[PDB]
Subunit: 78 residues, 2 copies
Amino acid sequence: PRITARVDVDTQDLLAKAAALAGMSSINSFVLNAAIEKAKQVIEREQALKLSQADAVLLMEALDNPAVVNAKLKLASE
Amino acid sequence: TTLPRITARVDVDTQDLLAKAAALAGMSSINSFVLNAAIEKAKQVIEREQALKLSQADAVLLMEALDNPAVVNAKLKLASE
């Protein structure tokens, strides 16, 4: 139930400068917020990669059953 | 361990979010994901500010040119010819 990490000199320097700029008062706060935002981005990216293949899934269906896919499209415009 | 560790308490919802994201990113632990998330965000925060200053520095210079358009036009003419 605890996120925890060792930092060395260079990372502390990096995170403190970023926390200052980001208006945070602690490194800990900066880190937690950075992690949640990235978690959301990673999760959204996987869903988005699925949807981006949607044209090809549909093309593969059309290649297999061109007439049925044309009929389905024709029904949808009614 | 010379420097203070990063440490935050998370609720179950946040932990599971970070655990799901950690698995998708192919990382073995949340703490790894968290530190790498924090480091890459720090770089982007730092460079966004560097970009922000440059962009305001450039508007100061353009604003100075708009206040001195004859001198600006003289300099442009030299480069033109």
